[PDB]
A paper describes a structure:
The [name] domains are not as well resolved in the main double-filament class, probably owing to conformational heterogeneity, and we therefore focused structural analysis on the single-fibre filaments. A 3.3-Å-resolution cryo-EM reconstruction of the dominant class of single-fibre filaments reveals that [name] oligomerizes through formation of a repeating laterally translated array of parallel stacked protein dimers that buries more than 3,000 Å2 of surface area between two pairs of dimers and locks the [name] cyclic dinucleotide (CDN)-binding domain and associated [name] effector domains into filamentous assemblies capable of reaching greater than 300 nm in length. In the [name]–c-di-[name] complex, individual dimeric units adopt a two-fold symmetric conformation and form the basic repeating building block of the filament structure (right). Compared with the modelled open apo state and partially closed 3′,3′-cGAMP-bound conformations, recognition of the signal from the correct nucleotide, c-di-[name], induces an inward rotation of the [name] β-strand ‘lid’ region of about 25° and about 9° respectively and results in formation of a tightly closed complex. Thus, complete closure of the lid domain and structural compression around the high-affinity ligand c-di-[name] is essential to translate CDN recognition into a conformation sufficient to seed [name] protein-filament formation and downstream signal induction. The primary [name] filament interface occurs along two surfaces that pack between adjacent [name] dimeric units and drive lateral head-to-head oligomerization. These surfaces centred around the hydrophobic residues V280and A309 are exposed in the closed [name] domain conformation, explaining a key mechanism that couples c-di-[name] recognition and filament nucleation. Individual [name]-domain protomers (STINGa and STINGb) within the [name] filament are also bridged by an electrostatic interaction between STINGa R307 and STINGb E290.
Stimulator of interferon genes ([name]) is an antiviral signalling protein that is broadly conserved in both innate immunity in animals and phage defence in prokaryotes. Here we use cryogenic electron microscopy to determine the structure of the active Toll/interleukin-1 receptor ([name])–[name] filament complex from a [name] cyclic-oligonucleotide-based antiphage signalling system (CBASS) defence operon. To define the molecular basis of [name] filament formation, we reconstituted signalling of the S. faecium [name]–[name] ([name]) antiphage effector in vitro and used single-particle cryo-EM to determine the structure of the activated complex. In each [name] dimer unit, the canonical V-shaped [name] CBD is positioned above two [name] enzymatic NADase domains that dock against the base of the receptor.
Numbering used by the authors:
A (entry chain D), C (entry chain B), D (entry chain A), E (entry chain F): 2 to 69, 73 to 118, 130 to 241, 252 to 322
B (entry chain C): 2 to 68, 73 to 118, 130 to 241, 252 to 322
F (entry chain E): 2 to 69, 74 to 118, 130 to 241, 252 to 322
């Protein structure tokens, strides 16, 4: 599944397909050959895959004998590696290099990959599939904010003050459990419509966190929920921002079901849920009391 | 004042002075010569520079002959691609001479050829007042804040003309809101600054009225000041920036860093710029919404 | 378990794995070969292992015949030994040296290790696994301060003045026993949230040490507890500092469950508990009255 | 005033003078020539120098030819460089390499300084003077713990309730502000005796942060202060830990006035105050409301 | 048990182990081979054993044929014997010498040891195990002072003036017996904490020696005790000094239970008790009325 | 005034003069030539010299060739080790030439190689104001006196601010103490000097107040002079020193010995030095405690 952009020179077209075989299955190894859309600039398509491919396995070999004789890698490949590295990062972009390909002088002292090599590469790939860092699409950062502004805040407040405020009347929280519902698919308009739908299907009564006059400048946290056991349910409104940034991430001329963006937004919901699950295992005020529901409806 | 990573070849030097002078004196154009921090490896400091440098003007030249193509160095093209993927097509530019036979991934693409340099400077002036998606979400968080809070709240008030506080439906004759961007980002996020600023002024809590028809919508508790409500709030989303900043620029050092101060201030400026543009983007939030960037 | 960094030159790749065999099991021998992360500078990875590996067994052999002829050790290996020694210390970093490898002139008069050698090495390693000295992460120093500021202070005060001050009313301490609860896992935000959870789950009433006006500049010591026998329970707040310094110890780009830091932080809690247990056996005011609970929840 | 371990080769001598002069006169740059204390072995005194010397500017040169022909520096120079790198840190230790010294390949691709070079290094040292690293003896870590555990906590508590409790009297805090009193010299017994002396001298009365009944698993912070303007101020007790660490930093069989210890202890007090003074501008609740009276009495 | 440092040249490795056999059991014969700690200077380890090993059996043989031909002993062995003799003394350091090894010209006219020889050596070893002289650790001198300042003083005063002063009221001493309790293990902070514990567990009422105005400049001697028979009990506070000098005796980098110092401190309590028991058999004012309790709690 | 055992080889003689002159005239540098007392065996007088000599500056040279090597004499290394184990690493020093291939227990260790001699002299000046653990406990007894009496008494007075005498809890408004070290050590210990000095001035007994909470603590009866108490005391522990001196320097001779007078005076100086350092070592005993060394 995970989309991997394999960039290599036109003459390195048999190593490419060997590397495709070497990590065949559970990964959508896409080469640079089918990564170029018709009637599009090569740089545009390269940037665009950079915005789609999860990782990159660029292959640098003995070509373009250069001058400063020294068999360097390929200016196309070096450009591509720079681009993918700047967009994705060393964690996510990798440079297979054969025995002596004379890496750039910027790429010196940096251990690049040199068949078992692909094996270790794939293990590292899986290692980084459990890790969520910042990206142009702010799923990681949006999850961090959602958790350090609402989930952690609400969890701490309910743990602290034994009550939630429905309608100004206060009800008492004896058992506390909240479910973060990640919609299976984001609407163009955001999540507000799905949120209203979902809330209305269930009883999900609207109550807010109880404040005290001890802290004057403290904000309340309205939410929906079901000596009461409370099944709090929240659909992160921040996900709307995602469907906004996607419009900036991949500006699209046409209106229609785009697989590229369907995958991109599903991946970003994946990352949002992953980050939330991590950050729930983190704090004891949320450990075991916040559950995450992924791929809903 | 604007940081500009200029990168070229260890041989191609007085063009770098020439371009630094031509770009002028108001922007700070850091060369790659001093961009390499001590006891760090070149790729690593270059990635740091991408995280810091705003724009790029690398210089492709007739450096290395190859196999009979007079290409630039690999380092120049590598840095160019790294900044292109880090910053973006209009936050990174390439100064190629008449004949440098750039990579064929760059063929057919507009690459800048003294008047060239001032054209680039005008382009940079343009891109200074636009806003791109960034690795650390300053425009994305602004978009989310506007579409989720400010547009929502303004529409709510214009709709019901009334706002609710401890069940009292107080009437809103005149409406308007202010966005208070702190001058510096608090380590804990803007929660403590927010509490200070709500305590200082008479900023009382109030929630947007929720009609019973819309059973799956939540109101927006905020702080304000048939009455003229002097509404104003600190965007809490700024706390995220703080988080992101570390995941942007991790560092083992506890103290006053100029690089970080500049980066964090720039992101505050970008947030305010996006919000100020997005308020003219809508009628319900035009004239009814102001930005007090750099408060206290 | 204990992670041991075996550093040696690329041609000494059979001695490495032999030394791995000689101290196989109950130790996570990591070689320098798999100690280098991809797309990272060698110095960065070396420093980074220095911040993970508990010990080091660097192997210096007959290579790099140098000039001042004398078959010295390897500049990579010498650098690595210097680095690990400066970071860890002689107690923790060791230099296997073959019969005549011509140690540096700084390393003269210093008995370095020369298969039975590995045996003695392992005995010394076990000896030093029971010993806790200062480190970049201040688990040892934080425990020392926690014990010479709270545990010793509270123990002596209760032993001296036969009362603790709950609510301003004084209750009398007939039998005295306090439990230092080390959480099994530290939260990002510190221990305050775990502390509040734990205190609220148990009765853990909040009372403080009784002061007297005889000494004006003496500070009180609030704590939680259950002619009363008192089951004092304390979760060291100082552990928060650890999770703080860890952020500086291993600055991490990504958000996610990192085994490296999970092990590092578990090890630092290990050291904190070990130092505390030592320091309880130390003073008679605490001997037998302070117990330590490790790996809690 | 700043101590600077300059280390080079027993042949590479007048360069050491040039660099000492170029670094200037305001900093004390101790050469490796006099760094070797009598009746001690070289490694041991070098480790002591790491414990003492703040920054490092070793000098790699074309000393020893080798066989990997490679004109390497001496093994001693690289060993010292690594030892200081692992002891101090990458930006508290620097290497002055000539045009061609083919440094170890763990250092390849890494920025090593090549009179203007020396003053660039001096500017770096001026930079690193106002930052704070994690240290073997916890001066920044203890400051972080003190701030996050006491000063941030106390300031937030007071700003919240605006009231503080003493023998059950909830006295009101109209104006709030605190001072951090760092003693000029660290008392042997820790700062307990200095703290009691200073509390006795002035009218510093005890007072605890008010604890609301909602937060049943939180402890107040008894402190010493001076709707009223409270002139709050306290000596950080954590400083006592430093004393302990100092011995575990610099053990010595000698009872008397040691300049090495006086300098070390003073530097750690300065680093603590520097970290705290930066961390107070780091936060709103502790900005202007918190001052540092470093070197009192 | 008793640790005996057997120092000999590297080629004299069969006589060493023969002498180990020849005086096997009730002695912990440690050779110079395992007396060298890793990553430590040879001189450091030698001095350190000098501070651990009770005795020494240094072996001087026919090696280092020197010039002034004459087969002298070994510069290593001669150094070691000089060091151990200067630190311990002839009573405690011994030099086995073979038939004609040409002792130094300083060691002339001095009868050194020449299998039955080991027998006599061991008899002398037991003789000196029954003898307590001055040392770096002042157990002997501290006991002497404790007995010529408190035990003898108090014994004479009670024998003389038939009363002890409790609270200013005088109680009459018909039968007199005092027990000197040596704690089984000394705390870092001294004995004060053990002293308070022990005193408080028993009734041990606090009374002092009765002075008279006949002698104006006579000091009182407070103590604790149970026409009254009086079971005086005293824990020598001077033992605190021991745990102080130990810190100077063996300055330790690390925090943890050290067997070397555990043994050293147990040995020093042994010597203190032995000296006290001797000095009680000495004076008739203390004979039979003062008992010594060793290895307490 | 400072005694310095200089020891060398029966061949290396004018070097001994040279070093004696270089060390100067203010310190008394006794050679090994006259260190050998008549009708005593060499080891015995050397041990006596260790008991007397404060510092050592032996001289290793190219005396005896060997086979393993131009080592110094066995006697020189033996004396060096004897003083090292008797005095300490920084109270004994070795002056080795460029090539003397010292024992391999001393390999890799810093041994001094005219400027060398004055560097050693500066080191000796350093070690003059530090204090090591000694065979006869002058620093150890000072540590015990400070931690057991002076720190304790000062802390007690600062705590209760009151002291008790025949049940009267008299108030201590201003506190301060003096430590009276006798010029010469009385044979019986300082008990008789203490009684004389208490008789001369009006030094009345007074005990630190003991609160009932601490049921297993003893007060400190002492002699003093809301009132300004002119506290001062002779450290009784000095009597121990007397004892130790014999167990340090046994001798069958009754009379005025310069060696003993120097030794006992040096130990009194070392006691006072340790105490004077340990009072600035602590706040509760700083300015409130003074040392009147060599009284009467
Ligand atoms: N059920 C519930 N979820 C909450 C609440 N507050 C925050 N969240 C969740 O946390 C996410 C990020 O909040 P933020 O970082 O503090 O940053 C927020 C904040 O600055 C502002 N904002 C959002 N909601 C409110 C509000 O109710 N009152 C005020 N005064 N500001 C709000 O817009 C930023 C982004 O908002 P979002 O896109 O909506 O995404 C929100 C939203 O998904 C709450 O009160 N109730
Ligand atoms: N239950 C309880 N535990 C205590 C208390 N005081 C100290 N501890 C524990 O001892 C550890 C180290 O205390 P510290 O070295 O004196 O160093 C402390 C101290 O200088 C200061 N501090 C902490 N608590 C207080 C307080 O309540 N009052 C005042 N004036 N200062 C405090 O912050 C430093 C670090 O604090 P921590 O990270 O929290 O870590 C604290 C904390 O885990 C107490 O009063 N009650
Ligand atoms: N129960 C009891 N034991 C006693 C008493 N006096 C001495 N000892 C014991 O005798 C040891 C040696 O006393 P010191 O040689 O005269 O030398 C002593 C003395 O000069 C001084 N000192 C100790 N206690 C007192 C005191 O109560 N009053 C005065 N004026 N000086 C004291 O400190 C020196 C070392 O004291 P330490 O380490 O404690 O060790 C003391 C202590 O263990 C006493 O009055 N009651």
């Amino acid at each position: 599944k995970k989309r991997i952009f394999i960039g290599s020179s036109s003459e390195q077209l048999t190593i490419l397909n060997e590397i495709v075989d070497l990590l065949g299955d559970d990964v959508e190894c896409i080469p640079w050959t089918d990564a170029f859309a018709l009637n599009k600039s090569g740089l545009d398509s390269l940037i665009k895959q950079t915005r789609l491919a999860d990782y990159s396995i660029l292959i640098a070999t003995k070509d373009d004998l250069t001058k400063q004789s020294l068999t360097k890698p390929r200016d196309n490949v070096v450009f591509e590696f720079g681009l993918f590295l700047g967009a994705a990062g060393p964690e996510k972009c990798y440079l297979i290099a054969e025995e002596d390909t004379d890496l750039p002088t910027d790429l010196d002292g940096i251990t690049v990959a040199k068949d078992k090599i692909v094996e270790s590469i794939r293990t590292h790939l899986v290692k980084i599939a459990e890790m969520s860092q910042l990206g142009l699409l702010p799923s990681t950062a949006l999850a961090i904010g959602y958790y350090n502004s609402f989930i952690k805040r609400v969890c701490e407040e309910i743990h602290g003050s034994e009550c939630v405020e429905l309608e100004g009347k206060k009800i008492k929280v004896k058992s506390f459990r909240v479910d973060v519902v990640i919609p299976e698919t984001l609407d163009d308009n955001g999540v507000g419509n799905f949120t209203t739908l979902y809330n209305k299907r269930y009883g999900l009564s609207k109550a807010t966190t109880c404040t005290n006059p001890a802290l004057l400048g403290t904000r309340g946290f309205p939410f929906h929920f079901k000596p009461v056991d409370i099944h709090l349910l929240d659909i992160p409104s921040t996900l709307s921002t995602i469907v906004e940034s996607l419009k900036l991430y991949l500006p699209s001329n046409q209106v229609g079901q785009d697989f590229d963006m369907d995958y991109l937004e599903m991946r970003e919901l994946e990352n949002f849920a992953k980050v939330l699950k991590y950050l729930i295992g983190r704090n004891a005020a949320t450990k075991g009391y916040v559950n995450v529901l992924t791929n809903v409806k």
